[PDB]
Amino acid sequence: MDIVNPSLSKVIDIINKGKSKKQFKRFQSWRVKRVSESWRKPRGIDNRMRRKFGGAPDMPGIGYKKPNAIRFLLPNGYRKIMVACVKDLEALISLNSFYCAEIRHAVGSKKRIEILERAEELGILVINKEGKLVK
Amino acid sequence: QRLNISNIKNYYTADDIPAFAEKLLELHKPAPIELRTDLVQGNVVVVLEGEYASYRVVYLSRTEDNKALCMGLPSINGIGLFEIDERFLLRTSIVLDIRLDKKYRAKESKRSFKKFNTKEKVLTKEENDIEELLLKEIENEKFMKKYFETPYEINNTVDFYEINH
Amino acid sequence: AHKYSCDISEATSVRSQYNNIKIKFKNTREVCNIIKTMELNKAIAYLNDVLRFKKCIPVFRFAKKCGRTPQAKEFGTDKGKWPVKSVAFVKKMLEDLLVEAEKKGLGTSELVIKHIQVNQAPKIYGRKHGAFGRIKPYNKSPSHIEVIAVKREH
Amino acid sequence: MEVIKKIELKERVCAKGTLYSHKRSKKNIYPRYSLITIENVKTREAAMKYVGNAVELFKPESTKEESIHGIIKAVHGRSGAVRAKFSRNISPVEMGSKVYIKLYKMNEDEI
RNA sequence: AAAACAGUGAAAUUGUGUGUGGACCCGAAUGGAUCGGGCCCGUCUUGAAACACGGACCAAGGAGUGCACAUACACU
């Protein structure tokens, strides 16, 4: 869509290139199909990952948490709020400097048209703008 | 207040973010680079980078911070008037006695290039003029004309910093 | 209706498919594998030689402990076989496509076997009695078949 | 053919060296830094005069990028070898290759 | 004992086509050979990679609960 928050425009690329792409897969989820990828802490008496031997993978923890300012920020430099009514946009009228709107999936075509018309006149960014309404 | 905002929005006071943005910008700002002192009008120099590398040329002026202006000899070695980063020049102890009337500007010689300029060569009045000045200082001198024609070659048998230029 | 397993134009092609056939799965795919990309008249000629024990079907995937044979050298291997029951069925199936080709107004020549595939059909259950008062399975493994032939652009 | 010309241009103006290892202990490797030897430089005092200089790895058979740039950061050991940093990490397949030393200094940010 | 809708139609497992590798995971890369680190989990045990036991594969089900009687804490 190629849009950016004006307050961060000259900084956003540093921020984006700085985000981690680490994944914390569950131990041995690569060995048997019955174990999903979702993280669970290992609790075995012998387990090599719990005991932190070199060569085993890394475990999650507080050290990896991002700085408080950068956290929750989308790649366009805004935070997101969910909307499903015309009367919801009315809340964003004070916050449009830092927040943007994302219309919920279940809202149908006829109603979406009414949301977008209101978004234009109030000056609010909607990130699902194209959505289903491309046809 | 409407229920969408009383929960989601609560994560951060985002009014603080401008202060963070400034501090981050400061930290990743480039360091300064020093303008050199060692070069005098009419010094011969050797080009180290880009399409004209290996040739001797004559230094004319500082231009735009680290940018400097040089002339080849379109008759002798075919190189015209150009601009380059002043660090891409190796100094040598020969100085010609040229003095110029006015400031002039030319295309930059970027470090990354795709293709050679084998053809399409022409000259301006100022290129003509400056050649017809430089040439006078060169004609009177013994082997100087040939000196400008042979490319430079680094000695492959001794450490560079042992040699003098 | 039937969704054939790939996309080729209705003009310039001829097709057939069958379900739950009562020829043996593993034998049938070794037959189909070797006649892929072959010209239709060549295919019918080759399969006639297999019925007479003059040429063989080579084996590559379902092939453990199989016999070695001088006829396999034509395909750069030692191992081959003569599965008569599967060959008779495939031969009939291919001959019918030449009827369709002629009737449709393509030539009887320049047709090439572009697609052919075999799939497993559901098992038919049976039993055998063993020693010490046991009963063990004795099932049958049928198959499904598709073919598409196209005219060479040349 | 531009490749044949770009080589001869570089050959006339640079010193030559070879890439031989990453920075490593007996057990672990640190692939962000690489070790180079320069042709006729054979003491630590001689090698100090190159700290700060630009280096280039040129690879004509590459489909992505024809050359990688870097900088010499420090001397290593007592027999004139050095440590350098490049814009991208050097692959183990690229060890043994020829490197060019460029006779001008650059800043750590430029690479 | 099993067996609901002539709905939707996951995983194990099979064939065909197209790509990438020779058990696989983590860290770092190339146009391209690869480099460094890692023994199979759960469990009793002073001590498990064990020549200790359980585990062929996938789905679904599957184990600190309710009442009575004294009790210490927090809240009214």
Under 8 Å between Cβ of A87 and A29: no
Query: What residues of chain D lie within 8 A of the CB of B49, using their CB?
Result: 102
Question: Searching chain B, which residue's CA lies closest to the CA of residue A82?
Answer: B4
Identity of the amino acid at A97: S
- Report d(CA B53, CA D100) in Å as an integer: 14
Q: What are phi and psi of B14, to 5 degrees?
A: -80, -5
After which residue numbers is chain D interrupted with C–N beyond 2.5 angstroms?
Answer: none
Strand pairing category for D53-58 and D29-38: unpaired
- Distance between start and end Cα atoms, chain B: 79
Strand pairing category for A79-83 and D15-24: unpaired
Tell me, rounded to whole angstroms, the distance of Cα C4 from its chain centroid.
Answer: 16
Query: Mind telling me how many Å the CA of B3 is from chain D's nearest CA?
Result: 48
Query: Mind telling me how many Å the CA of B37 is from chain D's nearest CA?
Result: 15
Measure the CA angle with vertex B93, ends B88 and B97; round to 5°.
100
Query: Mind telling me how many Å the CA of A71 is from chain B's nearest CA?
Result: 9
- Distance between start and end Cα atoms, chain A: 18
Question: Searching chain A, which residue's CA lies closest to the CA of residue B13?
Answer: A69
- Report d(CA A125, CA A80) in Å as an integer: 10
Under 8 Å between Cβ of C57 and C31: yes
Beta partners for residue A82, in sequence order: A102
- Report d(CA A76, CA A2) in Å as an integer: 8
Structure letter (DSSP) for residue D84: E
Residue D49 half-sphere exposure toward CB, CA atoms < 13 A: 12
Identity of the amino acid at B106: A
B22 in A contact zone (CB under 8 Å): no
Task: Look at A71 and B14 and tell me if their CB atoms are within 8 Å.
Answer: no
Query: Any residues with CB less than 8 A from the CB of C139 and at least 6 apart, and which?
Result: C123, C124, C125, C126
- Report d(CA D14, CA D24) in Å as an integer: 28
- Report d(CA D75, CA B80) in Å as an integer: 41
Under 8 Å between Cβ of A17 and A23: no
Under 8 Å between Cβ of D39 and D55: no
Q: What are phi and psi of B6, to 5 degrees?
A: -65, -10
Residues 53-82 of B with CB under 8 A from A: none
Question: Searching chain D, which residue's CA lies closest to the CA of residue B162?
Answer: D46
Cβ neighbour number for residue B67 with a 10 Å cutoff = 14
Q: Which of A69, A118, A65, A128 is nearest to A98 (CA)?
A: A69
Structural determination approach: cryo-EM
Under 8 Å between Cβ of C16 and C96: yes
- Report d(CA C129, CA C60) in Å as an integer: 34
* Nearest residue to E29 via alpha carbon and C1': D91
Task: Look at D103 and B160 and tell me if their CB atoms are within 8 Å.
Answer: yes
C112-127 burial, b if ≥16 CB within 10 A, otherwise e?
A: ebbbbbbeebeeeeee
Query: Any residues with CB less than 8 A from the CB of B118 and at least 6 apart, and which?
Result: none
Structure resolution, Å: 10.8
Task: Look at B54 and D5 and tell me if their CB atoms are within 8 Å.
Answer: no
Task: Look at B21 and A68 and tell me if their CB atoms are within 8 Å.
Answer: no
Query: Any residues with CB less than 8 A from the CB of A106 and at least 6 apart, and which?
Result: A84
Cα torsion A92, A96, A100, A102: sign: positive
In order of A14, A18, A108, B24, B70, the CA distances from B27 in angstroms are 11, 14, 47, 5, 36
Angle subtended by helix axes C25-35 and C40-51, to nearest 10: 130
- DSSP E strands in B38-80: the ranges are 43-47, 56-64, 67-71
Q: Which of C99, C89, C83 is nearest to C149 (CA)?
A: C99
Beta partners for residue B62, in sequence order: B68
Helices of type H across C1-146 = 25-35, 40-51, 84-104
Identity of the amino acid at B16: D
Q: What are phi and psi of C70, to 5 degrees?
A: -60, -15
Beta partners for residue D72, in sequence order: D84
